[PDB]
Amino acid sequence: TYSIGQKLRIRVGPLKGYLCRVIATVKLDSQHKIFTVKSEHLAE
Amino acid sequence: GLQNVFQSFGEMLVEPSWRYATVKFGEVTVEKPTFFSDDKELEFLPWHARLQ
Amino acid sequence: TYVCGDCGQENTLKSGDVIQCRECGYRILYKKRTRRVVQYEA
Numbered sequence: 001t002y003s004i005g006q007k008l009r010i011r012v013g014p015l016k017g018y019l020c021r022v023i024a025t026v027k028l029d030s031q032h033k034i035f036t037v038k039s040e041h042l043a044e
Numbered sequence: 045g046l047q048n049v050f051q052s053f054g055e056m057l058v059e060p061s062w063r064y065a066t067v068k069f070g071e072v073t074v075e076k077p078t079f080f081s082d083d084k085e086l087e088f089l090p091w092h093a094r095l096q
Numbered sequence: 097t098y099v100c101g102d103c104g105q106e107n108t109l110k111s112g113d114v115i116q117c118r119e120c121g122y123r124i125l126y127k128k129r130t131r132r133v134v135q136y137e138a
């Protein structure tokens with residue numbers, strides 16, 4: 001699948017197109033929310 | 045007014061604890077502030093201080 | 097890469113060096129912004 005520290009994109013959702021970084025469970029580049037989503041909802 | 049602190053508080057007479065000894069503080073000078081980096085002296089402006 | 101505080105000079109930093117602009121000697125050094133891209137929602 002993926003690896004720690006990758007930069008992925010939130011494909012579908014209220015938060016779409018946001019870029020985020022995968023702490024372990026992604027974290028957004030400039031906001032404090034730690035969301036967790038499955039692989040289908042994440043893109044390079 | 046710093047001179048004055050020194051004009052008062054006068055010539056000490058160092059105690060024969062057969063020998064006298066006198067001490068005579070005179071003009072007092074104050075020098076702009078400076079900082080010594082390695083050999084060189086550079087200006088210290090307040091900011092450098094606050095940050096160092 | 098850090099940039100000197102009182103003149104613009106950049107140098108890598110070696111661990112344990114008293115932080116000093118090698119060139120001018122003042123001791124304040126600031127880190128530098130790389131080009132990395134950050135997204136801010138507006």
Ligand SMILES: [Zn+2]
Pocket residue numbers: 100101102103104105117119120121122
């Ligand atoms: Zn410098």
